[PDB]
Amino acid sequence: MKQYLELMQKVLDEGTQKNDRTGTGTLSIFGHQMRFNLQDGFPLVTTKRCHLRSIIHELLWFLQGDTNIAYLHENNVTIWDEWADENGDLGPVYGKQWRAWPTPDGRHIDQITTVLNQLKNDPDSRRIIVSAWNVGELDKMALAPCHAFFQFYVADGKLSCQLYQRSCDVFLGLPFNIASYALLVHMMAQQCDLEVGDFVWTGGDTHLYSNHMDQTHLQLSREPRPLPKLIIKRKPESIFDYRFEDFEIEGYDPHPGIKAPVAI
Amino acid sequence: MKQYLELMQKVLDEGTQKNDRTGTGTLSIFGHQMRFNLQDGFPLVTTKRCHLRSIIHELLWFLQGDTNIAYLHENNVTIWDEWADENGDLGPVYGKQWRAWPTPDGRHIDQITTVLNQLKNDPDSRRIIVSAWNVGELDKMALAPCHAFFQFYVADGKLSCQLYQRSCDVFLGLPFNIASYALLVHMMAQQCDLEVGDFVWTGGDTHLYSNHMDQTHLQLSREPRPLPKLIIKRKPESIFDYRFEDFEIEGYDPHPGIKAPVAI
Numbered sequence: 232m233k234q235y236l237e238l239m240q241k242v243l244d245e246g247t248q249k250n251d252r253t254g255t256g257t258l259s260i261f262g263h264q265m266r267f268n269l270q271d272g273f274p275l276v277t278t279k280r281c282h283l284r285s286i287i288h289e290l291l292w293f294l295q296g297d298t299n300i301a302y303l304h305e306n307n308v309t310i311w312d313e314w315a316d317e318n319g320d321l322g323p324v325y326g327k328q329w330r331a332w333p334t335p336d337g338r339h340i341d342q343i344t345t346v347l348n349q350l351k352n353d354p355d356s357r358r359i360i361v362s363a364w365n366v367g368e369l370d371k372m373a374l375a376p377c378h379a380f381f382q383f384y385v386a387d388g389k390l391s392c393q394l395y396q397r398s399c400d401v402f403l404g405l406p407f408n409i410a411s412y413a414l415l416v417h418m419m420a421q422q423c424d425l426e427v428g429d430f431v432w433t434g435g436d437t438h439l440y441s442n443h444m445d446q447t448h449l450q451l452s453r454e455p456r457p458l459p460k461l462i463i464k465r466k467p468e469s470i471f472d473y474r475f476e477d478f479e480i481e482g483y484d485p486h487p488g489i490k491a492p493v494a495i
Numbered sequence: 496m497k498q499y500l501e502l503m504q505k506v507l508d509e510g511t512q513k514n515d516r517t518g519t520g521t522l523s524i525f526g527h528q529m530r531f532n533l534q535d536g537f538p539l540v541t542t543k544r545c546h547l548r549s550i551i552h553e554l555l556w557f558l559q560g561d562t563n564i565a566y567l568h569e570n571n572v573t574i575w576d577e578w579a580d581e582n583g584d585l586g587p588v589y590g591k592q593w594r595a596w597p598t599p600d601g602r603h604i605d606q607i608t609t610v611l612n613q614l615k616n617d618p619d620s621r622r623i624i625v626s627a628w629n630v631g632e633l634d635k636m637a638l639a640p641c642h643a644f645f646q647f648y649v650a651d652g653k654l655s656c657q658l659y660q661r662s663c664d665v666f667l668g669l670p671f672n673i674a675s676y677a678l679l680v681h682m683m684a685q686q687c688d689l690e691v692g693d694f695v696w697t698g699g700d701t702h703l704y705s706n707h708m709d710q711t712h713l714q715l716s717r718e719p720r721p722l723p724k725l726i727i728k729r730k731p732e733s734i735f736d737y738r739f740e741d742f743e744i745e746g747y748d749p750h751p752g753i754k755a756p757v758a759i
């Protein structure tokens with residue numbers, strides 16, 4: 232997609248070489264923002280084929296508050312495999328913080344339910360926020376939340392969402408991150424009888440891995456195809472009652488998939 | 496400053512008329528980013544005189560984990576008066592989260608100390624993060640955190656910082672928010688023997704109050720002057736040992752101050 236390729240090029244042009252936790256090395260910029268008007272189409276990267284089924288199942292999984300990968304494995308989704316322990320656990324990552332953020336009282340806050348209620352009851356609120364950045368639980372997590380903090384906004388009957396992503400593997404992660412949040416916005420907008428507005432993506436450490444460079448140069452040579460259209464085939468009774476079969480992506484005409492290794 | 500006036504003008508032009516918590520009424524946009532290279536000058540707004548005394552005191556007060564306005568009152572800094580209870584308490588707002596984020600353990604995490612330790616010891620970390628957004632404490636706070644989430648980055652000997660601000664009163668708050676985080680970066684840079692890099696400001700609900708409209712037109716009519724330069728007079732033993740007297744601003748030649756009422 233145009234903004235995605237622009238970002239990729241910017242990292243090449245303006246990124247600094249920078250070592251990384253994984254061992255591999257990156258070109259990195261700090262601070263970036265892109266906007267996707269979800270009325271223009273569903274922002275699924277077309278310059279390579281993305282594994283939408285993994286994106287859909289992963290979001291459904293977050294929404295269930297699940298942090299054991301058994302569900303992903305039941306649906307043949309492997310993107311979380313490297314960080315799961317022997318029992319399939321990842322610790323209290325996104326799903327847990329989204330549905331059951333823990334507090335001293337032995338209490339738990341369902342941020343997704345809260346945000347739904349704000350959207351329905353108080354859409355003008357300026358604190359329609361979900362955070363996965365539970366400082367007190369970070370060391371229990373297999374991996375620190377990357378898509379850390381997001382906020383919704385309503386105007387002119389349209390639901391917008393801004394994500395703050397602290398760290399972004401532009402080649403592997405970002406297409407998943409964009410589509411996942413774009414999908415959540417549609418779902419939430421459906422539940423709240425709103426139209427979809429913008430997804431605003433904001434990045435912190437935004438990088439290309441040194442061993443994704445061939446892939447990146449290949450992708451940059453490709454022309455973006457028109458955005459597909461997301462169809463939701465029914466209206467589940469709540470944001471928690473969706474199933475994989477509810478979604479169809481129409482007119483997704485991507486260029487071929489490009490293989491690249493995840494830096495563990 | 497050019498980027499500040501540009502934003503102000505953007506809100507006026509593109510902003511949606513929207514109701515708000517305080518009942519004042521606003522023009523609002525969602526999602527905006529600005530970048531200040533702190534090497535170019537200290538980003539203290541020049542198209543009106545800004546009260547750096549209040550910015551410094553609030554920051555020292557944050558860093559002490561203090562959440563009672565008593566220290567602010569003592570130095571005649573009155574910005575928080577509207578929200579304190581009788582005993583001067585604001586509840587567990589920024590200072591408490593920054594210094595003593597309580598965990599479900601009887602434990603307290605000091606995020607400022609962790610960030611310094613990260614900067615000194617693991618500067619390439621992509622999770623040098625402070626969050627004020629403690630979901631389980633929000634109901635006890637006098638005000639939900641505005642400047643909610645921030646992240647540091649180190650490249651080329653320079654410390655950059657990105658703030659995610661969920662809600663931003665562009666006329667009153669933003670100039671303080673910008674200066675406050677710019678000052679913080681300088682202090683952090685100093686305490687980590689780094690230079691200053693960029694301050695990246697990212698906004699969620701970014702707005703102008705209907706009753707700051709005369710003030711905004713005044714300010715928009717004024718040409719920015721050169722940015723001032725921050726002087727720190729000594730180097731304290733830690734990030735926690737700074738005193739209001741440590742700070743001089745040189746070459747600040749603002750247009751006259753512009754009065755505006757806060758929306759309580």
Ligand SMILES: C#CCN(c1ccc(C(=O)N[C@@H](CCC(=O)N[C@H](CCC(=O)O)C(=O)O)C(=O)O)cc1)[C@H]1CCc2cc3[nH]c(CO)nc(=O)c3cc21
Nearest residue numbers: 282285309310311400403404405407408489490491493494
């Ligand atoms: C954003 C996001 C969701 N995640 C992903 C997403 C995609 C991937 C991934 O490896 N994608 C590849 C493979 C996708 C995939 O599973 N494809 C199936 C399986 C193919 C295969 O087995 O390789 C298929 O094509 O049939 C791709 O997009 O081509 C890995 C983690 C998270 C899980 C934890 C994680 C660690 C990550 N670490 C790193 C460091 O390189 N980068 C990430 O982007 C990254 C992303 C994630």
Ligand SMILES: C#CCN(c1ccc(C(=O)N[C@@H](CCC(=O)N[C@H](CCC(=O)O)C(=O)O)C(=O)O)cc1)[C@H]1CCc2cc3[nH]c(CO)nc(=O)c3cc21
Nearest residue numbers: 546549573574575664667668669671672753755757758759
């Ligand atoms: C960003 C920030 C820090 N804050 C401020 C900062 C400044 C102000 C403010 O009223 N500033 C005025 C006065 C600044 C000031 O301290 N002036 C005194 C004036 C004398 C006095 O009255 O004491 C002086 O120069 O000495 C101004 O910049 O023109 C209010 C809150 C926070 C504290 C809680 C808060 C609520 C806020 N509410 C609202 C809704 O309109 N907007 C905010 O920007 C806002 C900002 C804040």
Ligand SMILES: O=C1CCN([C@H]2C[C@H](O)[C@@H](COP(=O)(O)O)O2)C(=O)N1
Nearest residue numbers: 357516639641642662663664668669
């Ligand atoms: O540091 C700050 C504090 C908060 N504000 C403004 C933003 C809002 O206009 C107001 C907080 O109101 P709410 O968003 O919670 O409804 O204060 C700001 O601009 N900077």
Ligand SMILES: O=c1ccn([C@H]2C[C@H](O)[C@@H](COP(=O)(O)O)O2)c(=O)[nH]1
Nearest residue numbers: 252375377378398399400404405621
């Ligand atoms: O949703 C995600 C999760 C992770 N990453 C990438 C960013 C980094 O390359 C890596 C995580 O490494 P750290 O930032 O935690 O070091 O995975 C993403 O792009 N999106």
Ligand SMILES: [Mg+2]
Nearest residue numbers: 309310312493
């Ligand atoms: Mg894999």
Ligand SMILES: [Mg+2]
Nearest residue numbers: 573574575757
């Ligand atoms: Mg005042």
